[PDB]
């Protein structure tokens, strides 16, 4: 059958289940797997973010090395909005206001004079012995102090254990954030994991009663089959088939693999978009829908530039 | 510098052409393949990635009934843009109807 656009603008609906900070779970009823997988695969690898690319060390006298520290810094989510920034043009190590950010992680560790008699708890003995990500001074360059408020360019979490120091031991580095997508390197991905699942339908082909309904209620995940009394017998009915983890434990039971028809519902996906905090999950999904459109715009522009006639 | 090549069947046949879409993968070519196969003037629409070390897709569009294969390709691009614009609209109108019940319920 052909593509009736008013059959898609009549049987498509997004039902948001739960949305909070750094998480989202919604439906997409009436969409096939080839567009749903496109949205999933643009959330994971094509929606761009900002992340640390170059590290400029001086006196890393720490046990965490000069290399593993740089890789560990690159995997830190930076809370700059990607859309304000451009791709850094190639072969340009020094950056400008448009392309790069800069931070600075300068932490010395020195012995604590006070509150240290006959103890061994390490917080009482040393100052600056856990280099956390709240130690990153944002060094603004060019004119970025006016575009962004005081305290927006920022690491997302501020509780990430970068290194662990001892007295004498120092970290003095400088960073350069760049823009990239989650296909160049996976430190640029803005999503924890974005994934979909079909909606299950569990159909009782036969009325279950009595001692088999409590057996049926434990073969599924807790929440699916409720067992409530209807005139002396304990009948069972389905209730939230969304909760079912689809573990097929009822097909291990011989008496009750003939009273359920466990299958799925076609084109009734349940997404789940968990952000790493760089962008909220309702702007990641919109900027995942708006990249598939740009991939479709660029090729129509190429065909317009190829044919003149 | 361009990012679409068209490779004819014999230099004369314009029904079969294998579009070489540079800098794509199965994100676009699985959803283009879904839209162009919804066109009844297409005998055959399938795609393959050339080799996973490379970064392009081959897209065979093979049209019956005397059409060039640029028209099912353009119709399947606009007809996917018109899916995504509508999905964007019904998604930005259900996030808003969720924020307007999280807030305006007891606060």
């Amino acid at each position: 059958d052909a593509w009736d656009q008013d059959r898609f603008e009549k049987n498509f609906r997004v039902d948001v289940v739960h949305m909070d900070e750094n998480s989202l779970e919604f439906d997409m009823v009436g969409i096939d797997a080839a567009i749903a997988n496109a949205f999933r695969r643009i959330l994971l690898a094509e929606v761009p973010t900002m992340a640390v690319e170059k590290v400029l060390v001086y006196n890393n006298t720490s046990i965490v090395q000069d290399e593993i520290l740089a890789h560990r810094l690159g995997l830190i989510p930076i809370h700059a909005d990607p859309r304000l920034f451009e791709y850094r043009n190639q072969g340009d190590e020094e950056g400008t206001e448009i392309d790069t950010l800069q931070f600075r992680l300068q932490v010395r560790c020195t012995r604590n004079p006070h509150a240290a008699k006959d103890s061994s708890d390490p917080n009482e003995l040393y100052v600056n012995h856990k280099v956390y990500t709240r130690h990153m001074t944002w060094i603004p360059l060019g004119n970025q102090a006016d575009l962004f408020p005081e305290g927006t360019i920022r690491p997302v979490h501020d509780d990430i254990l970068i290194a662990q120091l001892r007295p004498g031991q120092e970290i003095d580095l400088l960073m350069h954030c760049v823009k990239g997508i989650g296909k160049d390197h996976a430190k640029f991905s803005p999503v924890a994991t974005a994934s979909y699942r079909l909606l299950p339908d569990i159909t009782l082909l036969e009325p279950v009663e009595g001692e088999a309904a409590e057996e049926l209620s434990r073969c599924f995940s807790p929440g699916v089959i409720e067992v409530q009394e209807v005139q002396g017998k304990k009948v069972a009915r389905v209730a939230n088939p969304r909760l079912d983890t689809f573990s097929r434990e009822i097909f291990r039971n011989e008496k009750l693999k003939k009273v359920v028809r466990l299958a799925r519902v076609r084109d009734h996906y349940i997404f789940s978009v968990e952000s790493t905090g760089v962008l909220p999950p309702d702007v990641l999904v919109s900027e995942a829908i708006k990249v598939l459109m740009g991939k479709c715009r660029r090729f129509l522009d190429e065909l317009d530039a190829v044919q003149m006639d | 510098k361009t990012a679409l090549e068209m490779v004819q069947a014999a230099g004369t046949d314009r029904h079969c052409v294998t579009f070489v879409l540079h800098e794509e993968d199965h994100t676009l070519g699985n959803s283009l393949r879904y839209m162009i196969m919804k066109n009844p003037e297409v005998e055959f629409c399938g795609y393959t990635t050339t080799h996973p070390s490379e970064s392009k897709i081959n897209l065979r569009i093979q049209t019956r009934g005397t059409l060039p294969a640029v028209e099912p390709f353009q119709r399947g691009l606009n007809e996917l843009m018109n899916v995504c614009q509508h999905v964007l609209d019904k998604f930005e109108a259900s996030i808003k109807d969720y924020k307007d019940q999280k807030a305006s319920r007891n606060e």
Partner: peptide, 8 residues
């Protein structure tokens, strides 16, 4: 797998 609050 909570039931959706923005339903039919």
């Amino acid at each position: 797998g909570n039931p959706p609050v923005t339903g039919p």
